[PDB]
Each structure stands twice: as C-alpha cells, then as structure tokens.
Amino acid sequence: QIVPDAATCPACLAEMNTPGERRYRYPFINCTHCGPRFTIIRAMPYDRPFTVMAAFPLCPACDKEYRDPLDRRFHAQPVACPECGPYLEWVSHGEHAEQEAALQAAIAQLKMGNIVAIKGIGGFHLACDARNSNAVATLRARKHRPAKPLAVMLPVADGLPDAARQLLTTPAAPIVLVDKKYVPELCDDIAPGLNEVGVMLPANPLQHLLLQELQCPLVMTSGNLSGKPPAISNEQALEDLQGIADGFLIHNRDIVQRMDDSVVRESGEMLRRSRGYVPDALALPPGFKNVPPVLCLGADLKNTFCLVRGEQVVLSQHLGDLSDDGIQTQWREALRLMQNIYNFTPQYVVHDAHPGYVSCQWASEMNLPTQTVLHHHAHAAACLAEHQWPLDGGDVIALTLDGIGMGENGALWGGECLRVNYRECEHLGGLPAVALPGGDLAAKQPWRNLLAQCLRFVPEWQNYPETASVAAANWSVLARAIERGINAPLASSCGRLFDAVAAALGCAPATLSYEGEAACALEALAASCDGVTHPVTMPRVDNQLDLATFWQQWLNWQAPVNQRAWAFHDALAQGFAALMREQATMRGITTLVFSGGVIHNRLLRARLAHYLADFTLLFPQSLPAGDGGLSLGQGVIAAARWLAGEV
Numbered sequence: 001q002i003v004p005d006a007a008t009c010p011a012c013l014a015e016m017n018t019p020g021e022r023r024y025r026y027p028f029i030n031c032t033h034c035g036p037r038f039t040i041i042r043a044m045p046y047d048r049p050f051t052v053m054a055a056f057p058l059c060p061a062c063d064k065e066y067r068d069p070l071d072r073r074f075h076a077q078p079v080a081c082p083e084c085g086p087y088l089e090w091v092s093h094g095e096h097a098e099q100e101a102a103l104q105a106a107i108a109q110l111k112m113g114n115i116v117a118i119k120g121i122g123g124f125h126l127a128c129d130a131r132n133s134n135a136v137a138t139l140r141a142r143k144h145r146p147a148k149p150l151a152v153m154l155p156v157a158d159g160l161p162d163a164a165r166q167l168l169t170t171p172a173a174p175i176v177l178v179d180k181k182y183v184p185e186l187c188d189d190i191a192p193g194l195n196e197v198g199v200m201l202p203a204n205p206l207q208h209l210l211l212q213e214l215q216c217p218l219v220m221t222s223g224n225l226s227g228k229p230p231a232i233s234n235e236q237a238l239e240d241l242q243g244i245a246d247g248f249l250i251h252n253r254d255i256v257q258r259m260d261d262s263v264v265r266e267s268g269e270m271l272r273r274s275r276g277y278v279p280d281a282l283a284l285p286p287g288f289k290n291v292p293p294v295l296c297l298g299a300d301l302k303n304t305f306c307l308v309r310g311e312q313v314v315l316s317q318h319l320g321d322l323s324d325d326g327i328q329t330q331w332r333e334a335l336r337l338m339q340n341i342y343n344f345t346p347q348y349v350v351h352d353a354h355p356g357y358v359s360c361q362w363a364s365e366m367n368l369p370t371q372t373v374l375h376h377h378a379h380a381a382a383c384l385a386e387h388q389w390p391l392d393g394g395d396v397i398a399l400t401l402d403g404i405g406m407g408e409n410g411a412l413w414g415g416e417c418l419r420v421n422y423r424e425c426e427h428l429g430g431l432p433a434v435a436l437p438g439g440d441l442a443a444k445q446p447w448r449n450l451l452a453q454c455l456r457f458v459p460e461w462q463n464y465p466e467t468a469s470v471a472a473a474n475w476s477v478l479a480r481a482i483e484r485g486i487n488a489p490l491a492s493s494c495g496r497l498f499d500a501v502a503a504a505l506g507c508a509p510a511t512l513s514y515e516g517e518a519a520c521a522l523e524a525l526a527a528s529c530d531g532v533t534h535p536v537t538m539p540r541v542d543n544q545l546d547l548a549t550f551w552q553q554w555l556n557w558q559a560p561v562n563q564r565a566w567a568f569h570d571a572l573a574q575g576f577a578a579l580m581r582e583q584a585t586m587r588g589i590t591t592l593v594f595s596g597g598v599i600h601n602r603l604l605r606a607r608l609a610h611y612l613a614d615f616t617l618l619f620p621q622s623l624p625a626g627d628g629g630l631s632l633g634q635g636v637i638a639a640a641r642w643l644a645g646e647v
C-alpha cells in the first residue's frame with residue numbers, strides 16, 4: 001500500500017541530531033515510517049527503481065540497512081546518506097555553495113532579514129523572519145500580495161492549545177489555524193485584518209535543521225507566481241522566483257507530484273486536503289457497493305478530482321484554479337499516478353453542469369460517457385457522504401451558501417434552500433437573484449454588489465453615508481448596463497451579499513487582492529463582538545429572504561462596526577433558519593445539511609446551530625465545505641444514479 005507523505009519521525013530526527021552518526025545533519029534522512037511517498041513515485045510498484053531515487057545507487061552501509069529485516073530502514077525505498085544521496089545547493093546572485101555550507105548560507109540570509117526560496121517535499125517555499133516587519137513587507141511587495149495571510153513555521157508547538165498541538169504533530173503535519181493571540185512574536189503584517197494565523201511545524205529534515213538553527217518563527221509560504229502553477233523543478237523555481245527570493249536553497253532529489261501543505265482549523269475542520277492525506281481512500285456511505293470506475297472532475301476553483309469504484313473513493317490533492325496557465329500538466333500527472341496506484345481505468349466521467357468550465361472542456365476530450373451534476377447538489381451530497389448518510393437514507397433540506405455556481409436552467413445560484421437526496425435536487429428558495437455588475441468584476445470590487453443591492457432594494461440609497469463613495473462616482477453608467485442586462489447576470493449569491501455589507505461598512509479595500517477577502521474581513525470584525533441585542537432581520541416573503549426590510553433596518557441601526565457586522569450574520573442565519581424550518585417541518589424532514597464555501601464561516605455556523613436546535617444538523621468537517629469537496633459529491637451522486645439503474 002502507498003501511504004501519504006510523512007513528517008520525519010522521532011527516531012530519524014534523533015539519528016540526524018547525533019554527532020558520529022553517518023546521517024548526522026543529513027537533510028534527506030528517512031526510514032520505513034517517514035519521508036516522501038506520493039511525491040517521489042514515478043510508477044508502481046513502490047520500489048526504488050520506480051521512484052526518483054533510482055538515480056542514487058546506495059553505498060554498501062546504506063544497502064546493508066535497506067536489506068536487514070529488523071532495521072528501521074528496511075526497504076526504505078528513498079533511503080540515502082551523505083555518501084550516496086542527494087545534497088543541498090545554494091544559489092544567490094553569483095554565489096554558490098553546497099551541503100552544510102549551502103545550509104549555513106541560507107541561515108545567514110534569513111537571519112539578516114532576507115527572503116530565501118527553500119525546496120520542500122511537494123514544491124518550494126518562500127521564507128523569512130516572521131517577526132521582521134521589513135522582511136515581511138518586502139515579501140508582500142515583491143509577490144504583490146498586500147493582504148492574503150501568510151503561513152508561519154514555528155520551531156515548536158509550546159504555548160498553543162492542546163487541540164492545535166495534537167494536529168500539528170501528526171505525520172500529516174498540516175498548517176493549523178490558531179487564534180493570533182497565542183503567537184505574539186509574529187509581526188502584524190502576517191494576517192492583517194484577520195483573527196487567526198496558520199502555523200505549522202518542521203516536517204522534513206531540512207526544515208528541522210533550519211528551525212533548530214533559527215529558533216524563531218519563519219514565514220513559510222508557497223513558492224509560486226499568482227496565476228501560475230507552483231514550481232516543482234529547480235529550473236522553474238529559479239525562473240518564477242528570481243524577482244522575489246534573495247537566494248535559493250535547492251537540491252537534486254526530483255519532486256514528481258505537486259503537493260501543497262494541508263490546512264486545517266484547530267477544531268479539526270479541513271480547509272485544504274493535500275500533503276499527509278493524499279492518497280488515502282475513503283469508504284463510501286452504507287448501501288454504496290460494486291460501483292463502476294467513475295472519474296469526477298470537480299470544479300474549476302480549488303480543484304480536486306475523485307476516483308470512485310467498488311465501495312471507496314479517492315480524492316486528489318488540491319490542484320488549484322483550472323483556468324490558470326499550464327495547470328493541466330500537474331492535474332494530468334496527478335491523475336496518471338493515482339490511476340496507476342489504484343489500477344483504475346474510468347468507464348464514466350462526471351463534471352459540473354456549467355458549460356463554460358475548463359473541467360467541462362477537459363471531459364469532452366476523454367471518449368467516455370459523460371454526465372453532469374449541479375454544483376450545489378454536489379456540495380450537499382459531499383456533506384451527506386461525509387456523514388455516512390445511507391443510499392436509501394431519505395431526503396434532507398440543504399442550505400448551500402457560496403459565491404457562484406450554475407443552477408437549474410442556467411441560473412446562477414449561491415444562496416439556496418434545496419430538498420436533496422443522492423439522486424434529486426429540488427430548489428425551494430433562498431436569496432433573491434441580484435445583478436453582478438461587470439460580471440467577473442463583481443467578485444473583485446465589493447461596492448458593485450452594494451450598488452446592485454441599493455438599486456433594487458434601498459429607496460434614496462444616495463443619502464446614506466454607507467454609500468458615499470458609490471454615490472460620488474458616475475454609477476449611473478453602470479446602473480444603465482444593469483437595467484439592460486449588459487454583463488450584469490442575476491445571481492442569488494451569499495458571497496456577494498457579504499461583499500455588499502463589507503462595502504457598506506468599509507472593512508476591506510475598494511478593490512480586493514484575493515477571492516473572499518471582503519467576507520473574511522467582515523467575519524473577523526463580527527467575531528470580536530460577543531453578541532448584541534439588535535433589531536435587524538431578514539423576513540421570509542414566500543420562499544425568499546426580504547432584503548428590502550433587511551437593508552432598511554440594517555442601514556438605520558447605528559452601532560459600533562463589530563456589532564453591525566455581527567447583526568448581519570445573526571439576521572442572515574435567523575432568516576435562513578426560518579426558511580429551512582418551514583420547508584423541513586411540512587415535509588416531515590428532521591435532518592438539515594449545510595454546505596458551500598460560505599459555510600466555512602464560524603459565526604454563521606454557530607448562529608445557524610443556535611436557531612436550529614430542533615433539527616439534526618450536518619456540517620462538513622473532514623472535507624472542505626467549498627469546492628475542494630465537490631468531486632466527492634459528484635461521485636456519490638453518479639454512483640447513486642447508477643445503483644438505481646438509471647438510464
């Protein structure tokens with residue numbers, strides 16, 4: 001069996017720190033229990049000749065250890081020592097070094113407040129002293145990332161809550177989001193405007209050597225260019241990162257598979273499932289058996305694919321935005337190895353119903369029967385599958401909250417109440433559909449969504465101080481485009497409503513630098529409020545939330561910004577709760593499901609659970625609520641349709 005890439009174990013770490021050991025300070029020490037796996041395999045079977053390590057014949061001392069059945073390194077496929085293995089290389093503007101000297105050059109650069117690219121297990125990181133305001137601002141400037149929070153590597157987990165330390169020290173070694181109050185050493189440009197910081201521990205020998213030396217937190221963020229796939233080869237690292245990194249700590253062991261760090265909350269909630277979890281298979285729910293080989297393509301953002309067969313499913317690592325330049329190479333290499341590992345040949349392909357998706361174009365190149373699944377049906381089903389809801393388990397009422405997905409008859413959904421089972425999705429109601437002014441621009445500039453909401457729902461909107469910058473523009477050109485349906489499609493998007501409220505509070509920049517930045521900012525603001533008595537509501541009118549009443553009460557309820565943010569989350573949760581209660585009770589449904597990327601909002605979860613104590617509630621935990629779990633949903637739905645003998 002192949003197991004996920006694993007953090008250096010205590011025994012290899014001790015061997016590495018023991019003077020006189022042959023592997024003393026060797027940055028590529030591994031044994032049968034730890035080290036790279038999925039990332040160094042060319043083809044099956046798992047055997048040194050079919051791994052990146054075939055290039056390095058073993059010295060006799062190594063080979064004796066590889067061959068002794070009682071030795072920790074028995075059949076350690078990528079075992080090596082300094083005599084026979086890979087070695088470090090340092091590259092920096094006409095300066096070069098190797099081995100221990102390569103390591104010391106990188107350490108001296110980091111200590112001086114410089115930024116170094118470091119080769120890891122599944123790609124390259126950019127690093128610098130996370131206490132150094134100057135270094136962190138220079139990294140943000142060079143990478144054009146003014147806001148998006150940076151992951152930080154700490155030497156140890158001391159001082160973090162027990163739940164965080166437990167997750168941080170598993171073989172998977174994820175990034176764990178922890179309250180920033182636990183880590184005062186971090187300069188304030190690490191996650192500005194947010195309440196959490198992603199911390200990780202050293203999990204490969206090179207990282208242990210660095211942190212043992214530096215004894216301070218290091219920014220350890222992905223080594224890529226925005227809009228491009230991460231580098232996995234030295235040449236592509238050297239090329240992509242030359243404007244950013246002051247020097248490069250690289251080496252000559254190949255990485256064959258892109259594998260980003262996994263990201264979880266301290267609570268155990270999965271955000272990004274990659275290194276340490278891939279390629280572990282998951283058991284399908286009861287009633288799923290003898291399923292034919294199905295390839296599920298997932299969706300266009302935060303992509304994962306899924307292989308479904310028998311009574312199991314296996315998800316790929318995070319592969320990013322499928323629209324990015326040359327991402328198909330990494331996607332394809334990941335598909336090849338995963339199919340090789342599981343001896344899998346698909347008979348069917350399932351993909352999203354949006355005909356404009358890249359993933360849909362890729363499906364048509366495959367020469368297999370294809371089928372389509374609505375985006376929000378798949379979110380809801382991934383959450384049912386994760387909770388082991390049986391094939392014949394019965395209908396639930398689902399709340400699927402995200403930015404935008406294609407719904408029935410070409411509609412753009414993102415804030416819907418649905419009656420759902422593994423075969424059917426019936427739309428019951430939700431947010432009103434509101435123009436996205438400027439189409440793709442509506443996700444980047446929150447004021448567009450505020451304008452769209454004001455035009456539809458807020459009489460005399462120009463008189464409110466919340467709308468001043470909008471009001472002062474020549475917004476009437478945009479208003480005219482909106483009336484005429486020119487690049488202004490209607491969407492009932494929960495994410496765009498967050499954006500509209502964030503625009504009205506002024507709590508993100510006018511143009512955003514990353515997807516979801518305004519919603520994250522609004523939630524961080526709301527979470528500093530412990531709850532407040534307020535008059536803001538979102539009544540139910542038929543089967544939609546009445547935003548006219550909402551805006552009138554919210555815009556006229558003066559209070560500190562945190563309390564206004566809180567009141568929005570509370571009113572939205574109460575209004576959706578009332579919709580779901582009526583829908584579920586009158587159909588005799590006792591179980592509710594919640595899914596979509598907006599459901600990663602902790603305040604909204606907590607408020608929903610508060611108003612829906614009379615129901616059994618299913619939220620995602622071991623898979624991402626967002627598009628990272630979508631392939632799974634597609635897979636259980638295709639399986640359930642086949643199992644029913646559907647045509």
Ligand SMILES: [Mg+2]
Nearest residue numbers: 159160182183
């Ligand atoms: Mg602390």
Ligand SMILES: [Zn+2]
Nearest residue numbers: 009012031034
């Ligand atoms: Zn080990």
Ligand SMILES: [Zn+2]
Nearest residue numbers: 059062081084
């Ligand atoms: Zn050796």
Ligand SMILES: [Zn+2]
Nearest residue numbers: 402405597627
């Ligand atoms: Zn989605």
